[PDB]
Amino acid sequence: PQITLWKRPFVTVKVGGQLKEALLDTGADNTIFEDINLPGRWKPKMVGGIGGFLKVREYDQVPIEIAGHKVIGTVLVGPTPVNVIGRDTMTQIGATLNF
Amino acid sequence: PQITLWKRPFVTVKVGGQLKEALLDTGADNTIFEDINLPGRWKPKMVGGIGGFLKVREYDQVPIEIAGHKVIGTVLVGPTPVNVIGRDTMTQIGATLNF
Ligand SMILES: CC(C)CN(C[C@@H](O)[C@H](Cc1ccccc1)NC(=O)O[C@H]1CO[C@H]2OCC[C@H]21)S(=O)(=O)c1ccc(N)cc1
Numbered sequence: 001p002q003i004t005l006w007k008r009p010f011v012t013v014k015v016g017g018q019l020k021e022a023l024l025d026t027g028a029d030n031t032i033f034e035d036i037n038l039p040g041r042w043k044p045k046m047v048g049g050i051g052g053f054l055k056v057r058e059y060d061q062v063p064i065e066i067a068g069h070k071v072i073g074t075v076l077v078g079p080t081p082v083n084v085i086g087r088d089t090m091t092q093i094g095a096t097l098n099f
Numbered sequence: 100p101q102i103t104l105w106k107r108p109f110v111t112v113k114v115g116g117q118l119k120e121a122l123l124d125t126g127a128d129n130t131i132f133e134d135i136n137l138p139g140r141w142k143p144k145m146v147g148g149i150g151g152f153l154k155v156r157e158y159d160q161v162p163i164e165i166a167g168h169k170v171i172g173t174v175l176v177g178p179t180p181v182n183v184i185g186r187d188t189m190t191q192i193g194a195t196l197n198f
């Protein structure tokens with residue numbers, strides 16, 4: 001797809017086999033979800049955004065699918081106010097910003 | 100250009116007569132700069148991100164030149180950790196996400 005930016009660029013994403021939606025966010029280094037329950041242990045990680053920091057749970061080798069592209073990546077789970085697909089995942093699906 | 104996302108997508112911007120650098124951020128609704136001095140009246144606003152809220156000043160009808168494309172629109176000013184170009188500005192230059 002070729003997505004304009006008049007509205008927030010949410011995409012359908014299946015993460016851990018669960019159908020969710022998340023914002024394609026070129027300003028985010030990492031992919032973060034708030035409304036998923038992933039299996040197994042996780043490791044503590046911290047991320048920093050506009051208003052300060054959050055403690056997140058880092059889950060590794062998680063399957064992610066967007067627009068037919070299935071990849072294996074790192075997913076953070078934490079109190080983000082909105083699910084975001086970061087550059088880590090977007091590079092895997094070959095997304096670019098164009099103008 | 101076509102911008103891959105292996106590194107943070109910074110672009111050169113001219114705002115308030117000054118050359119600045121800012122992150123092209125499709126997860127940001129609005130453009131925000133730190134420490135730039137704009138003429139005219141502003142209104143107080145708040146923006147919300149990961150980690151909490153940010154107090155900013157909103158200036159309207161601000162010319163911005165983004166990697167050499169002219170736009171007139173809203174510019175927020177406040178202590179963001181990184182200057183961001185948001186969707187409000189990127190829609191004015193026809194930016195799209197492609198995958
Ligand atoms: C979370 C988004 C929906 C909103 N943010 C834009 C976002 O792209 C920020 C943009 C950003 C970038 C750096 C620092 C602060 C904010 N990125 C971000 O928080 O990323 C975090 C997750 O991955 C990590 O990598 C970058 C920081 C971590 S935001 O900075 O809060 C924001 C909110 C409103 C406006 N108008 C402009 C920006």
Ligand SMILES: CC(C)CN(C[C@@H](O)[C@H](Cc1ccccc1)NC(=O)O[C@H]1CO[C@H]2OCC[C@H]21)S(=O)(=O)c1ccc(N)cc1
Binds near residue numbers: 154
């Ligand atoms: C920095 C501005 C973008 C925001 N200002 C918020 C304010 O808390 C800032 C917070 C602030 C200020 C500067 C840089 C980062 C953050 N403080 C401030 O101006 O303090 C002044 C008095 O001491 C002087 O030296 C320090 C700054 C000067 S503000 O214009 O008054 C403001 C207040 C409320 C809202 N909603 C939106 C904006």
